[model samples]
Target: MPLIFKIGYNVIPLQDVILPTPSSKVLKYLIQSGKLIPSLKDLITSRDKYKPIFISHLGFNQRRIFQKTITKGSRLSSIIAFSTQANVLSEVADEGIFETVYGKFHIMIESIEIVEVEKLKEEVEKHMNDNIRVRFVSPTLLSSKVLLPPSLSERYKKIHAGYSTLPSVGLIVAYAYNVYCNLIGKKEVEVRAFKFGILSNALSRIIGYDLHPVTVAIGESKGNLRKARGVMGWIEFDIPDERLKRRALNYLLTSSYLGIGRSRGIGFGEIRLEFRKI
Candidate 1:
């Protein structure tokens, strides 16, 4: 079965550098450009779809933040990589040094954790709470597949637009399940229909929110830069229905690992959960 592995690298900076990441895909870019070993090459490239991997933005002081630059004196931090195959991580650890636009730095694997579907199943069974908060750690971009037909405008219909910026209950829940599917090797078609009634029912669950606009530059498109606008904030909801609440928690927790929107494989669309009791 597919399970997500979070590999933490214990490392120190060799030089003072500004990370070469204008977008979320910089780690992928650096790894590709570095032209490292074949074992690592598959995880970083599209040549092998069977193995998927993600890189979190660099962290300093063992904490996650948006700071793009690091100083030599700040010595300790970590690089987090998520993957379905454990060997990719193993190979990464052996490679030791990473060549980047910033400079060459040593990579030492410190810890590895497994996020299995069974663990989530047990956690869901143990926790029961009506109120939950999901914090958007990255620019979480969603899709129009979440919109009900009644909510679509003529402008949306004219171009068959495909992206959404809001963190609706459906997108939030669906992405969680999607991450679950990735872990279990299940088809995404398992995500059933979303009729208007179901959508309406989910909408009324909101209690508090801290959403705001964020512009993300994903990459360059045809000699021009491609940008996506999305929301990066939190959403608090109170789901009175126990079944739905249980289901939502399962997905939310899974999302907390692999995240749930555009550029997810490289750490965008990351989310955090505020549960009743940790």
Candidate 2:
């Protein structure tokens, strides 16, 4: 079984705050404060076998473009979430004040829930598949490596590729499954069969009829002024197969709270899955 902690924070800036991206700063605060996880710094800095924590980007009311070090008002309040099995996030879900270089914010525990993967799997197996939508709450950052063919095209090299394809999403889930297994002190074979075989085959059969579309970008960070790219928005698709859809549901659930794709440690690839009728 895998456990997930849904942590929320209400951040109020003490002064005109600046950040590359809200998530990176929040992560810095979490690691530097050391109040949440005493050994977090060591765990993150050390050569780790698996990542135990997944973070999401801060949510704010204002529509601030994330390019360069943009200044913000002191009165601005933001909400942020973290999904993890870490002791502090799960065990000590409390309201407290945390200080950061940019500002100070009050942390609050909005909700906490544990996911019994075994039970979830059984539920998926029992129910018939449904149509669904996934909102990329945060930027779904993926690497070019996942989408590249064995032989690269010269044209492909110049384009900043972000793999928001269905297959890539499956790949993300496969990777997350491994991480989940590692955290639980269990060893398992890689989920290459689902990623490359069944899931791939399913999507290919109905290329245009079914959709899992994504909106993405590859450019400089709006707030931090660094080169960064990610996907945000949603993918609407359908799954008819019971077994295969169940596997996908598992990954969707995991990615919802835990996030998916690269740079999750600094808050990218946060997602939300919505089930609709077929």
Candidate 3:
């Protein structure tokens, strides 16, 4: 199980935003002020097998056109920060000051809730259903590499030229579990035929979808700006089988802490769900 903090800050931006989300700016602050969370620097410096901390760059209130204003991901300033280390971000709330290209804002923390992601697994499963709704509140970049093995078929390489916007159940199953293991240090050598046979199965069918393909500037590379192709919106799946439903639910629930989809570590793929048969 990992510890997480849902944090909100009232921010005043002095300039336009180049970074995609406000929460990223918060991370920028954490990175600069080593005393606030001392171990964060150690995590960045160390060559650990798994990342010790994770964050969700949750919102951007105003956006720009290069001819830009103060860009924020939501109307308000908020973000989710998570890590296996407890009380990391919880202590940050007391500091109450943050800065970015957007000038300085003495923040007002709206709320802080510390949660253990695994503790909520059973709680989330109780409301599980055949129909599950996932809203990608932030942009999600789903890559084919996460879904496919490295043995690229000759015909496949020509057909798929390397871009993906759709989310797949098999990938979600593999990814969520894979990251969960990383966070909790669980090991399972999958020698047993790898047979969920879940992939290529017809049970998980899309019930409804509202999606838009988009591109967002993630950061700068080699003094040049870089952007990512991704998708935004909601997709629902009607998954049959009680066990499969639980797997689906576990992915969604676990993602709330570890995040879902690729580029998540860089602040994409913030997801929310409709639990009560909505």
Candidate 4:
């Protein structure tokens, strides 16, 4: 079997640029017709089922429509994505609020010129004044979590209960090192960077197959930095091989971009990890 480990990247934020987003109007109309509600059982016609999201803050949050089907296998693994624009962090702040809020995870990247991956690395190195370090965590040391129901209205409560019925304080401990980076002055040096793929598709001339590679993210809030890392999520098919794993990392490093605005390139890191029956 291949080694399972969480690899990381350093993503940067892109300028605030709005691209055409999929219009929610069509679904909004369908919802108003009273065909779908309390989960997309009635309106969902195909194999793909839609999840209803009611953003208390955004009036637009609602279940668009869709069918319900569960795959044969699903499991949970602890994967975290981190990113930020904060210039400073308080010792008492919480970072998990950004990543594990609900039904999503992310892999954010730092913004760099699409044509120059090497130059981006150089800039990151220069910004850190050299002496930067790369960390390789033990892949054998894996963590687990209960997969909370994504569609549940009480999602925040579910997550809180699934992880711990009682409040536990180690949630932010994993990110302590990242916080230290900011307190010390390598201020914006985050390991993961986000490359906004939407912009890449619009402004750059890259291979069509190379867009939206499976990615990952890590965060450190104190340094005014939200870091993102990208890794190909599809690498599991050829699992048990280091060569394929490294290849997946290569694709992520080369094809990803960063965004700071809405849809901030952090979406890639918010991936679902499952358990495999060996």
Candidate with the greatest lDDT versus the true structure: 1
- Ten contiguous residues with the weakest lDDT in model 2: 204-213
Off by over 4 Å in 1: 10-12, 23-26, 29-43, 47-52, 60-70, 74-95, 146-163, 188-204, 220-223
* Clash count, one per candidate: 0, 9, 9, 50
Give the range where candidate 4 is weakest over 10 consecutive residues by summed lDDT. Answer: 50-59
Identify the superior model by TM-score, candidate 2 or candidate 3: 3
lDDT of 3 at 14: 39
Clashing pairs in 1: none
TM-score per model over all chains = 0.76, 0.70, 0.77, 0.18
Ranking of candidates on lDDT, top first = 1, 3, 2, 4
Superposed by TM-score, candidate 4 places the C-alpha of residue 120 at a distance from the truth, in angstroms, of: 22
Evaluated against the true structure, the overall lDDT of model 1 is 0.60
Give lDDT for model 2. 0.52
Q: What lDDT tens digits, residue by residue, belong to model 4 across residues 114-162?
A: 1333343343322221111111111001011212222343556533222
RMSD of 3: 4.6
- Model 3: runs farther than 4 Å from truth? 14-23, 43-54, 58-67, 71-75, 86-90, 99-102, 150-163, 187-201, 276-278
Model 4 CA RMSD to the hidden true structure, in angstroms = 23.1
**Once model 2 is optimally superposed onto the true structure by TM-score, how far is the C-alpha of residue 109 displaced, in angstroms?**
3.4
